[PDB]
Amino acid sequence: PVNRPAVGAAMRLPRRNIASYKQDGTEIPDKHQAEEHLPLKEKDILFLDGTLKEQADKLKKKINERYSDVRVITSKKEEEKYQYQFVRAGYVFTRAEGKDNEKEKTSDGKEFVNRFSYDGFVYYSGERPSQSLPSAGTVQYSGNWQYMTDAKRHRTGSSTDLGYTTYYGNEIGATSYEARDADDREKHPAEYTVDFDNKTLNGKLIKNQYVQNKSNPNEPKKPLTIYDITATLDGNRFTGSAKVSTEVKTQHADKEYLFFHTDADQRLEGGFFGDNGEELAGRFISNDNSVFGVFAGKQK
Amino acid sequence: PVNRPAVGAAMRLPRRNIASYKPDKHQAEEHLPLKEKDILFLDGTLKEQADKLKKKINERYSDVRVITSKKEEEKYQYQFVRAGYVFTRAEGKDNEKEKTSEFVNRFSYDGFVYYSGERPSQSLPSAGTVQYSGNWQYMTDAKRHRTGSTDLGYTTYYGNEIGATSYEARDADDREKHPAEYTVDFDNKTLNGKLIKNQYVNPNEPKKPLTIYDITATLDGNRFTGSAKVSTEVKTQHADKEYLFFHTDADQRLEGGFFGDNGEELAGRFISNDNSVFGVFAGKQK
């Protein structure tokens, strides 16, 4: 589950109950809504198989099973940069315009269930698990990552103030595809070093921070490491941890830390794809189920 | 921000980057001044404010021993104010690192100095002069070379790889390391004071105070704004030690206020002009 080897995994957008009445029509006490915090669940990690296209199609299918007539946006445009052959770290989602929220109401018309109609997944996919890996040497990979967070009403004592499209992070999970305060040139790069001598992987899941000069395409990037990855290789898999960088904790306590605050200890799993480990991909989920992340990489 | 009114403020320990990889035997960051933006403003009860600081430490390390200013501040029996600290030596913890493919290396220690106040005074005397006594704390920049840590009166590393602090002062009188004295003129609407170090020297053994800062401020409502100035004594007679830490004034960068019914107590903060020292202070009517 946390440890399951896979050729694909996904997490669906969590949508918390923002209703302020109970099913008996009585007010929820102390100004509270029915569900002010909705963590992710490991049981909700959706495991995938088949080709890259089949896996993506399955997730889009799931979106349309809920609403047949909503438009879907994908990460196809975002992942162009990487020219991945065997892996994906992507997303598929909808804003569900013109759809009412999911509601359940009393006879008198009071809402005791109210959930947003938004929907989406972040996921990784891999094809052709490696049959051979280098017996020696160190190899650099570069790529990207995506993420899906819990839904939480109060992260501190708006969602846009915190760098996300309105509501994301609060009434529904925060996602990489709704991050507004990142460098849209490349919001979420990732870097990895694989030591095939000692059989270790180290990496960084990075956010390129927002830059004021948006007219110069060669404006320098402002990287911020969100997670340090460490892992051990075993066959064509690797297992390890994602740890929130100290820098996030101390210098970004009022923003990034409100979303990325707990490690994923021994809760990161991935593997190599392409017959000779040309690429890699995987996932992690933090100890308190506050973030599900997926990541991918390609040899430099 | 530097001039923002507050009922509590804290500064976190600066930890400079001592990494020596990406020339001339230099480290990545040989001087780390403080920043006015890193002044952490606090609110809520005295307890709430302190707990927030302990929380931030625990957010970095869930399992470290935390040391507080509780024992030190007992003597003052403050009702409404605090000038304290919370810190950890982070025993057995690795430094903060980012790596080769080390271009970042920052110490594992952590801590804050802070002031806190509850119930800002809604009335003050319209006249008369009032004496206050209390204490202060401080946090300095981190600087590899202050001259051409133990010789300079601090626990190892403090002042160099991390900021020097009042709670790592080793050359002071343990009876009361950092007393403060104030006089408030409610006629002329002024505050004058001294932030002092009792130098190392029986409970009635004479003290050897050394004024570190002279404080001046003007009153406005239940607040006061002014300056902290390095003492004549430090600059001229302690050029080879204290002056290496206390060398620049805080001009119009000291802020505090009165707390309690009729200004029984006062507290505040200052930050020197070149961001070399952040100080906090508290006092109680004599």
Coordinates of C-alpha atoms in Angstrom, one line a residue:
Chain A
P1 CA 0.0 0.0 0.0
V2 CA 2.6 2.4 1.2
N3 CA 5.1 -0.2 0.1
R4 CA 3.3 -1.7 -3.0
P5 CA 5.6 -2.0 -6.0
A6 CA 3.7 -0.5 -9.0
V7 CA 3.9 0.7 -12.6
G8 CA 1.4 3.5 -11.7
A9 CA -0.3 5.2 -8.8
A10 CA -2.7 8.1 -8.4
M11 CA -4.5 10.1 -5.7
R12 CA -7.9 11.8 -6.2
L13 CA -8.8 15.3 -5.1
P14 CA -10.2 15.3 -1.5
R15 CA -13.4 17.4 -1.0
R16 CA -14.3 18.2 2.6
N17 CA -17.8 18.6 4.0
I18 CA -18.3 22.4 4.4
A19 CA -21.8 22.0 5.7
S20 CA -22.7 23.9 8.9
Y21 CA -25.8 22.0 10.0
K22 CA -26.2 18.4 11.2
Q23 CA -28.6 15.9 9.7
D24 CA -31.1 16.6 12.4
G25 CA -31.2 20.3 11.3
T26 CA -29.3 21.5 14.4
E27 CA -26.5 24.0 14.0
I28 CA -22.9 22.7 14.2
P29 CA -21.6 24.2 17.5
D30 CA -19.0 27.0 17.7
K31 CA -19.1 28.3 14.1
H32 CA -17.7 25.0 12.8
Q33 CA -18.3 23.2 9.6
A34 CA -19.0 19.5 9.5
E35 CA -15.5 18.5 8.3
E36 CA -12.8 21.1 8.8
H37 CA -9.9 18.7 8.1
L38 CA -9.9 15.9 5.6
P39 CA -6.5 14.0 5.4
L40 CA -5.8 11.7 2.5
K41 CA -6.0 7.9 3.1
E42 CA -3.6 5.3 2.0
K43 CA -6.5 3.1 0.9
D44 CA -7.4 5.8 -1.6
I45 CA -4.1 5.4 -3.4
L46 CA -5.3 4.1 -6.8
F47 CA -2.9 1.6 -8.4
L48 CA -2.6 1.5 -12.2
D49 CA -1.3 -0.8 -14.9
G50 CA -1.1 -0.9 -18.7
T51 CA 0.6 1.5 -21.1
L52 CA 1.1 5.2 -20.3
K53 CA -1.9 6.1 -22.5
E54 CA -4.2 3.4 -20.9
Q55 CA -3.3 4.6 -17.4
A56 CA -4.1 8.3 -18.2
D57 CA -7.3 7.2 -20.0
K58 CA -8.4 5.3 -16.9
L59 CA -8.1 8.4 -14.8
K60 CA -9.9 10.6 -17.3
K61 CA -12.6 7.9 -17.5
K62 CA -13.0 8.1 -13.7
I63 CA -13.5 11.8 -13.9
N64 CA -16.2 11.4 -16.6
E65 CA -17.9 8.6 -14.6
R66 CA -18.7 11.3 -12.0
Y67 CA -19.8 13.9 -14.5
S68 CA -20.0 13.0 -18.2
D69 CA -20.1 16.6 -19.4
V70 CA -17.2 18.4 -17.8
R71 CA -14.1 19.5 -19.6
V72 CA -10.8 17.9 -18.6
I73 CA -7.4 19.6 -18.4
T74 CA -4.2 17.5 -18.5
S75 CA -0.5 17.9 -17.8
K76 CA 0.4 17.0 -21.4
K77 CA 1.4 20.6 -22.1
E78 CA 3.4 20.8 -18.9
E79 CA 5.4 17.5 -19.5
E80 CA 6.3 18.4 -23.0
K81 CA 9.6 19.9 -21.7
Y82 CA 10.9 16.5 -20.5
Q83 CA 10.3 14.3 -23.5
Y84 CA 9.8 11.3 -21.3
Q85 CA 9.8 7.9 -23.1
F86 CA 8.7 5.5 -20.3
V87 CA 7.4 7.6 -17.4
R88 CA 4.9 10.3 -16.5
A89 CA 4.4 12.5 -13.4
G90 CA 1.2 14.2 -14.3
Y91 CA -2.3 15.4 -13.6
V92 CA -5.9 15.4 -15.0
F93 CA -8.6 17.6 -13.5
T94 CA -11.8 19.6 -14.0
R95 CA -13.1 22.9 -12.7
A96 CA -16.6 21.6 -13.3
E97 CA -18.0 25.0 -14.4
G98 CA -21.8 25.2 -14.0
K99 CA -22.0 22.2 -11.7
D100 CA -23.6 22.7 -8.3
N101 CA -21.8 21.4 -5.2
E102 CA -22.6 17.9 -4.0
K103 CA -25.3 18.4 -1.4
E104 CA -27.5 16.5 1.0
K105 CA -30.3 18.5 2.8
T106 CA -32.9 18.1 5.5
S107 CA -36.7 18.4 4.9
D108 CA -36.5 22.1 5.8
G109 CA -33.7 22.5 3.3
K110 CA -30.7 22.7 5.6
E111 CA -27.4 21.4 4.2
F112 CA -25.7 18.7 6.3
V113 CA -23.5 17.6 3.4
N114 CA -21.9 20.2 1.0
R115 CA -18.8 19.2 -1.1
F116 CA -17.2 21.0 -4.0
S117 CA -17.8 19.5 -7.5
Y118 CA -14.2 19.9 -8.5
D119 CA -12.3 16.8 -9.4
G120 CA -8.8 15.6 -10.3
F121 CA -5.9 13.3 -9.9
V122 CA -2.1 13.5 -9.7
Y123 CA -0.3 10.4 -10.7
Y124 CA 2.8 8.7 -11.9
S125 CA 3.0 6.0 -14.6
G126 CA 5.9 3.8 -15.9
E127 CA 6.4 1.5 -18.8
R128 CA 9.0 -1.2 -19.3
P129 CA 10.4 -1.7 -15.8
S130 CA 14.2 -2.0 -16.1
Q131 CA 15.7 -5.4 -16.8
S132 CA 19.2 -4.1 -16.5
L133 CA 20.8 -1.3 -14.5
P134 CA 24.3 -0.1 -14.4
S135 CA 26.7 -2.1 -12.2
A136 CA 28.7 1.0 -11.4
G137 CA 29.0 4.7 -11.7
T138 CA 26.8 7.7 -10.7
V139 CA 24.1 9.0 -12.9
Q140 CA 22.1 12.2 -12.9
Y141 CA 18.4 12.3 -13.6
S142 CA 16.3 15.4 -14.0
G143 CA 12.5 15.7 -14.3
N144 CA 9.5 16.9 -12.3
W145 CA 7.0 16.1 -9.6
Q146 CA 3.3 16.7 -8.8
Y147 CA 1.4 16.6 -5.5
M148 CA -2.0 16.5 -3.9
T149 CA -2.7 17.7 -0.3
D150 CA -5.2 17.3 2.4
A151 CA -8.2 19.7 2.7
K152 CA -7.9 21.9 5.7
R153 CA -10.1 24.9 6.8
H154 CA -7.6 26.6 9.1
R155 CA -3.8 26.2 8.3
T156 CA -3.0 29.3 10.3
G157 CA -4.7 31.5 13.0
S158 CA -7.3 33.3 1.7
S159 CA -6.1 30.4 -0.5
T160 CA -4.7 33.0 -3.0
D161 CA -2.7 34.6 -0.1
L162 CA -1.2 31.2 0.3
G163 CA -0.3 30.8 -3.4
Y164 CA -3.2 28.6 -4.7
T165 CA -6.2 29.2 -6.9
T166 CA -9.2 30.2 -4.7
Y167 CA -10.4 27.4 -2.4
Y168 CA -7.6 24.9 -3.2
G169 CA -6.0 23.8 0.1
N170 CA -9.2 24.6 2.0
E171 CA -12.5 23.2 0.8
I172 CA -10.6 20.8 -1.4
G173 CA -7.0 19.6 -1.5
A174 CA -4.2 21.8 -2.7
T175 CA -2.6 20.5 -5.9
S176 CA 0.5 21.3 -8.0
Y177 CA -1.7 22.2 -11.0
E178 CA -3.4 25.0 -9.0
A179 CA -0.2 26.5 -7.6
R180 CA -0.3 30.2 -8.6
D181 CA 2.9 31.5 -6.9
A182 CA 5.3 29.4 -8.8
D183 CA 7.3 30.1 -12.0
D184 CA 4.9 28.9 -14.7
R185 CA 7.9 28.4 -17.0
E186 CA 8.6 25.3 -14.9
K187 CA 6.8 25.2 -11.5
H188 CA 8.0 21.9 -10.1
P189 CA 11.4 20.6 -11.3
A190 CA 13.1 17.6 -9.7
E191 CA 16.7 16.5 -9.6
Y192 CA 18.2 13.1 -8.7
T193 CA 21.6 11.4 -8.3
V194 CA 21.7 7.7 -8.5
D195 CA 24.8 6.0 -7.2
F196 CA 25.0 2.5 -8.8
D197 CA 28.1 1.8 -6.9
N198 CA 26.6 2.1 -3.4
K199 CA 23.0 1.5 -4.6
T200 CA 21.5 4.8 -3.3
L201 CA 19.3 7.5 -4.7
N202 CA 19.3 11.2 -3.5
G203 CA 17.1 13.9 -4.9
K204 CA 15.4 17.2 -4.6
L205 CA 11.7 18.0 -5.3
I206 CA 11.9 21.7 -6.0
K207 CA 9.5 24.7 -6.5
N208 CA 10.7 27.4 -8.8
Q209 CA 9.4 30.5 -7.0
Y210 CA 7.4 33.3 -8.6
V211 CA 9.5 35.9 -10.3
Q212 CA 8.4 39.5 -10.9
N213 CA 10.0 39.9 -14.3
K214 CA 7.7 37.8 -16.5
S215 CA 8.7 39.4 -19.8
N216 CA 12.3 38.1 -20.1
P217 CA 12.2 34.4 -20.9
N218 CA 15.7 34.0 -19.6
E219 CA 15.0 35.5 -16.3
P220 CA 16.9 33.4 -13.7
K221 CA 14.9 30.9 -11.7
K222 CA 14.4 31.1 -7.9
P223 CA 14.5 27.4 -6.8
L224 CA 13.3 26.3 -3.4
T225 CA 13.8 22.8 -2.2
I226 CA 10.6 21.4 -0.7
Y227 CA 11.6 17.7 -0.2
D228 CA 14.9 16.0 0.1
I229 CA 14.6 12.4 -1.2
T230 CA 16.8 9.5 0.0
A231 CA 16.4 5.9 -1.0
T232 CA 18.0 2.5 -1.4
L233 CA 18.0 0.5 -4.5
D234 CA 16.8 -3.2 -4.6
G235 CA 16.4 -4.8 -8.0
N236 CA 14.7 -2.2 -10.3
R237 CA 13.0 -0.6 -7.3
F238 CA 14.0 1.9 -4.7
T239 CA 12.5 2.6 -1.2
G240 CA 13.1 5.5 1.1
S241 CA 11.9 8.8 2.5
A242 CA 10.9 12.4 1.5
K243 CA 11.8 15.0 4.2
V244 CA 10.7 18.6 4.3
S245 CA 13.7 20.8 4.0
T246 CA 14.7 22.8 7.0
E247 CA 14.7 25.9 4.8
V248 CA 10.9 25.5 4.2
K249 CA 10.4 25.2 8.0
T250 CA 12.4 28.2 9.0
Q251 CA 12.1 30.6 6.1
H252 CA 8.6 29.7 4.7
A253 CA 6.6 29.0 7.9
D254 CA 3.7 31.2 6.8
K255 CA 3.3 29.8 3.3
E256 CA 4.9 26.6 1.9
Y257 CA 5.3 25.1 5.4
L258 CA 1.5 25.3 5.9
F259 CA 1.2 22.6 3.2
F260 CA 4.6 20.8 3.4
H261 CA 5.2 20.2 7.1
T262 CA 5.5 16.4 7.7
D263 CA 8.0 13.9 6.4
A264 CA 7.3 10.7 4.5
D265 CA 9.5 8.3 6.5
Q266 CA 10.0 5.0 4.7
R267 CA 6.9 6.0 2.7
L268 CA 8.6 6.7 -0.6
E269 CA 8.6 4.0 -3.3
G270 CA 9.6 4.2 -7.0
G271 CA 11.5 2.3 -9.7
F272 CA 13.4 2.5 -12.9
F273 CA 11.8 2.4 -16.3
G274 CA 13.1 1.8 -19.8
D275 CA 15.1 -1.4 -20.3
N276 CA 18.4 0.1 -19.0
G277 CA 17.0 2.5 -16.4
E278 CA 16.9 5.5 -18.8
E279 CA 14.1 6.9 -16.5
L280 CA 12.6 6.7 -13.1
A281 CA 9.3 7.4 -11.4
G282 CA 7.5 7.0 -8.1
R283 CA 5.4 8.3 -5.3
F284 CA 5.3 9.1 -1.6
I285 CA 2.7 9.9 1.1
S286 CA 3.6 11.9 4.3
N287 CA 3.3 10.3 7.7
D288 CA 0.1 12.2 8.6
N289 CA -1.4 11.7 5.1
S290 CA -1.2 15.5 4.4
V291 CA 0.5 15.2 1.0
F292 CA 0.7 12.6 -1.7
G293 CA 3.5 13.3 -4.2
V294 CA 4.5 11.8 -7.5
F295 CA 7.8 12.3 -9.3
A296 CA 9.6 11.4 -12.5
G297 CA 13.0 11.7 -14.0
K298 CA 15.1 11.1 -17.1
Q299 CA 18.9 10.6 -17.4
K300 CA 20.8 13.8 -18.4
Chain B
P1 CA 8.1 46.1 10.7
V2 CA 11.1 47.5 12.5
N3 CA 8.7 50.2 13.8
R4 CA 5.6 48.0 14.0
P5 CA 3.8 48.2 17.4
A6 CA 3.5 44.8 19.0
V7 CA 2.7 43.0 22.3
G8 CA 5.5 40.5 21.6
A9 CA 8.5 40.0 19.3
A10 CA 11.2 37.4 18.9
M11 CA 14.3 36.8 16.8
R12 CA 15.5 33.3 15.8
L13 CA 19.1 32.2 16.1
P14 CA 21.0 33.1 12.9
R15 CA 23.0 30.1 11.6
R16 CA 25.4 31.1 8.9
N17 CA 26.4 28.8 6.0
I18 CA 29.8 27.4 6.8
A19 CA 30.0 25.2 3.7
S20 CA 33.3 25.5 1.8
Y21 CA 32.1 24.1 -1.5
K22 CA 29.9 25.6 -4.3
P23 CA 38.3 29.7 -2.8
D24 CA 40.7 31.6 -0.5
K25 CA 39.8 29.3 2.4
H26 CA 36.4 31.2 2.7
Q27 CA 33.1 29.8 3.6
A28 CA 29.8 30.4 1.7
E29 CA 28.6 32.9 4.3
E30 CA 31.2 34.5 6.5
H31 CA 28.8 37.1 7.9
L32 CA 25.1 36.6 8.4
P33 CA 23.5 39.8 9.7
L34 CA 19.9 39.7 11.1
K35 CA 17.0 40.9 9.0
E36 CA 14.1 43.2 10.1
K37 CA 11.7 40.9 8.3
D38 CA 12.7 38.0 10.5
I39 CA 11.3 39.8 13.6
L40 CA 8.6 37.4 14.6
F41 CA 5.6 39.2 16.0
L42 CA 3.7 37.4 18.8
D43 CA 0.2 37.8 20.3
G44 CA -2.0 36.1 22.9
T45 CA -1.2 35.4 26.5
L46 CA 2.3 35.2 27.9
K47 CA 1.9 31.4 27.8
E48 CA 0.6 31.3 24.3
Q49 CA 3.4 33.5 23.0
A50 CA 6.1 31.3 24.6
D51 CA 4.4 28.1 23.4
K52 CA 4.5 29.3 19.8
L53 CA 8.3 29.6 20.1
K54 CA 8.7 26.2 21.7
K55 CA 6.4 24.8 18.9
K56 CA 8.7 26.1 16.2
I57 CA 11.6 24.5 17.8
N58 CA 9.7 21.2 18.0
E59 CA 8.7 21.5 14.4
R60 CA 12.4 21.3 13.5
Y61 CA 13.2 18.6 16.1
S62 CA 10.4 16.6 17.8
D63 CA 12.7 15.0 20.4
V64 CA 15.2 17.7 21.7
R65 CA 15.7 19.1 25.1
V66 CA 14.4 22.7 25.3
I67 CA 15.9 25.2 27.7
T68 CA 13.9 28.2 28.9
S69 CA 14.4 31.5 30.8
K70 CA 12.0 30.4 33.4
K71 CA 14.5 30.1 36.3
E72 CA 16.2 33.3 35.3
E73 CA 13.0 35.4 35.2
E74 CA 11.6 34.1 38.5
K75 CA 13.4 36.7 40.5
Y76 CA 11.5 39.5 38.8
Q77 CA 8.1 38.1 39.5
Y78 CA 6.7 39.9 36.4
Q79 CA 2.9 39.9 36.2
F80 CA 2.4 41.2 32.7
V81 CA 5.8 41.1 30.8
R82 CA 8.6 38.7 29.9
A83 CA 12.0 39.2 28.4
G84 CA 13.2 35.6 27.9
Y85 CA 14.5 32.9 25.6
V86 CA 13.9 29.4 24.5
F87 CA 16.6 27.2 22.9
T88 CA 18.1 23.8 22.3
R89 CA 21.6 22.5 22.0
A90 CA 20.2 19.8 19.7
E91 CA 22.4 17.1 21.2
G92 CA 23.2 14.3 18.7
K93 CA 21.6 16.1 15.8
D94 CA 23.3 16.6 12.4
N95 CA 23.8 20.0 10.9
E96 CA 21.4 21.3 8.3
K97 CA 22.9 20.2 5.0
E98 CA 22.4 20.4 1.2
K99 CA 24.8 18.4 -0.8
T100 CA 27.5 17.8 -3.5
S101 CA 26.1 15.6 -6.2
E102 CA 28.2 20.3 0.9
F103 CA 27.2 23.7 -0.5
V104 CA 25.0 24.3 2.5
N105 CA 25.9 23.6 6.1
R106 CA 24.2 25.3 9.0
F107 CA 24.4 24.4 12.7
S108 CA 22.0 22.1 14.4
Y109 CA 21.4 24.5 17.4
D110 CA 18.3 26.6 17.5
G111 CA 16.7 29.2 19.8
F112 CA 14.8 32.5 20.2
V113 CA 15.1 35.6 22.3
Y114 CA 11.8 37.4 22.8
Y115 CA 9.7 39.8 24.8
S116 CA 6.0 39.3 25.6
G117 CA 3.4 41.6 27.1
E118 CA -0.2 41.2 28.2
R119 CA -2.9 43.8 28.9
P120 CA -1.3 46.9 27.4
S121 CA -2.0 49.8 29.7
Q122 CA -5.2 51.7 29.0
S123 CA -4.3 54.5 31.4
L124 CA -0.9 55.9 32.4
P125 CA 0.1 58.6 34.9
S126 CA -0.2 62.1 33.5
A127 CA 2.6 63.4 35.7
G128 CA 5.5 62.3 37.9
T129 CA 8.7 60.3 37.5
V130 CA 8.7 56.5 38.0
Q131 CA 11.7 54.1 38.4
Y132 CA 11.6 50.6 36.8
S133 CA 14.0 47.7 37.2
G134 CA 14.1 44.5 35.1
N135 CA 16.2 42.6 32.6
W136 CA 17.1 42.2 28.9
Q137 CA 18.1 39.5 26.4
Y138 CA 19.8 39.6 23.1
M139 CA 20.6 37.8 19.9
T140 CA 23.5 38.9 17.6
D141 CA 24.6 38.3 14.0
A142 CA 26.9 35.4 13.1
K143 CA 30.4 36.5 12.0
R144 CA 33.4 34.3 11.3
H145 CA 35.9 37.1 12.0
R146 CA 35.1 39.9 14.4
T147 CA 38.8 40.8 14.9
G148 CA 42.2 40.2 13.3
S149 CA 34.3 32.2 21.2
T150 CA 35.5 31.4 24.8
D151 CA 38.0 34.3 24.9
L152 CA 35.1 36.5 23.8
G153 CA 32.9 35.3 26.6
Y154 CA 30.5 32.9 24.9
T155 CA 30.0 29.1 24.8
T156 CA 31.9 27.5 21.9
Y157 CA 30.7 28.6 18.3
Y158 CA 28.3 31.2 19.6
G159 CA 29.0 34.5 17.8
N160 CA 30.8 32.7 15.0
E161 CA 28.9 29.9 13.3
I162 CA 25.7 31.0 15.0
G163 CA 24.6 34.2 16.7
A164 CA 25.8 35.1 20.1
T165 CA 23.0 35.2 22.7
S166 CA 22.4 36.3 26.3
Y167 CA 21.8 32.7 27.2
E168 CA 25.2 31.6 26.1
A169 CA 27.0 34.4 27.9
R170 CA 29.7 32.8 30.0
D171 CA 31.5 35.9 31.4
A172 CA 28.6 37.3 33.4
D173 CA 27.4 37.2 37.0
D174 CA 25.1 34.2 37.4
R175 CA 23.3 36.0 40.2
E176 CA 21.8 38.3 37.6
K177 CA 23.6 38.4 34.3
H178 CA 21.7 41.1 32.4
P179 CA 19.8 43.6 34.7
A180 CA 18.1 46.7 33.2
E181 CA 17.1 50.0 34.9
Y182 CA 14.7 52.6 33.6
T183 CA 13.4 56.0 34.5
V184 CA 10.1 57.2 33.0
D185 CA 9.3 60.9 33.1
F186 CA 5.5 61.2 32.7
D187 CA 5.8 65.0 32.9
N188 CA 8.1 65.4 29.9
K189 CA 7.0 62.1 28.3
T190 CA 10.4 60.4 28.2
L191 CA 12.0 57.1 29.1
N192 CA 15.7 56.7 29.8
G193 CA 17.4 53.5 30.7
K194 CA 20.4 51.2 30.8
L195 CA 20.8 47.6 29.6
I196 CA 23.6 46.3 31.8
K197 CA 25.8 43.3 32.1
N198 CA 26.9 42.2 35.5
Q199 CA 30.5 41.1 34.9
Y200 CA 31.9 37.9 36.3
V201 CA 33.1 38.3 39.9
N202 CA 28.8 36.5 48.6
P203 CA 25.2 36.9 47.5
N204 CA 25.9 40.4 48.7
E205 CA 29.3 40.6 47.0
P206 CA 29.5 43.9 45.1
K207 CA 28.4 43.6 41.5
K208 CA 30.5 44.9 38.6
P209 CA 27.9 46.4 36.3
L210 CA 28.9 47.4 32.8
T211 CA 26.3 49.4 30.8
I212 CA 26.0 47.9 27.3
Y213 CA 23.3 50.3 26.0
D214 CA 21.9 53.6 27.0
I215 CA 18.2 53.8 26.1
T216 CA 16.2 56.9 25.3
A217 CA 12.6 57.1 24.1
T218 CA 9.6 59.3 23.8
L219 CA 6.2 58.3 25.1
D220 CA 3.0 58.2 22.9
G221 CA -0.1 56.7 24.3
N222 CA 0.9 53.4 25.9
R223 CA 3.9 53.0 23.6
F224 CA 7.3 54.5 23.4
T225 CA 9.7 54.8 20.5
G226 CA 13.4 55.6 20.5
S227 CA 17.0 54.4 20.4
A228 CA 19.5 52.1 22.0
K229 CA 23.1 53.5 22.0
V230 CA 26.2 51.6 22.7
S231 CA 27.7 52.9 25.9
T232 CA 30.8 55.1 26.1
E233 CA 32.2 52.4 28.4
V234 CA 31.9 49.6 25.8
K235 CA 33.4 51.5 22.9
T236 CA 36.3 53.0 24.8
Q237 CA 37.1 50.5 27.5
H238 CA 36.0 47.2 26.1
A239 CA 37.0 47.6 22.5
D240 CA 38.6 44.1 22.4
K241 CA 35.5 42.1 23.6
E242 CA 32.0 43.5 24.2
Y243 CA 32.6 46.1 21.5
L244 CA 33.1 43.2 19.0
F245 CA 29.4 42.5 19.5
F246 CA 27.9 45.8 20.6
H247 CA 29.3 48.4 18.1
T248 CA 26.3 50.0 16.3
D249 CA 23.4 52.0 17.7
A250 CA 19.8 51.3 17.1
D251 CA 18.6 54.7 16.1
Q252 CA 14.8 55.1 16.1
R253 CA 14.6 51.3 16.1
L254 CA 13.7 50.7 19.7
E255 CA 9.9 50.1 20.3
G256 CA 8.1 49.1 23.5
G257 CA 5.0 49.8 25.6
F258 CA 3.5 49.7 29.0
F259 CA 1.5 46.8 30.3
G260 CA -0.6 46.3 33.4
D261 CA -3.1 48.7 35.1
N262 CA -1.3 52.2 35.0
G263 CA 2.0 51.0 33.5
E264 CA 3.3 48.8 36.4
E265 CA 5.5 47.1 33.8
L266 CA 7.0 47.8 30.4
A267 CA 8.7 45.8 27.6
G268 CA 10.1 46.0 24.2
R269 CA 12.6 45.3 21.5
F270 CA 15.3 47.0 19.4
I271 CA 17.4 46.1 16.4
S272 CA 20.7 47.8 15.7
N273 CA 21.1 49.9 12.4
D274 CA 23.3 47.3 10.7
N275 CA 21.3 44.4 12.0
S276 CA 24.1 43.2 14.2
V277 CA 22.0 42.9 17.4
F278 CA 18.4 42.2 18.3
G279 CA 17.6 43.1 21.9
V280 CA 14.5 42.6 24.1
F281 CA 13.8 44.1 27.5
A282 CA 11.3 44.2 30.3
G283 CA 10.8 46.2 33.6
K284 CA 8.7 46.6 36.6
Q285 CA 7.9 49.6 38.8
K286 CA 10.2 49.7 41.8

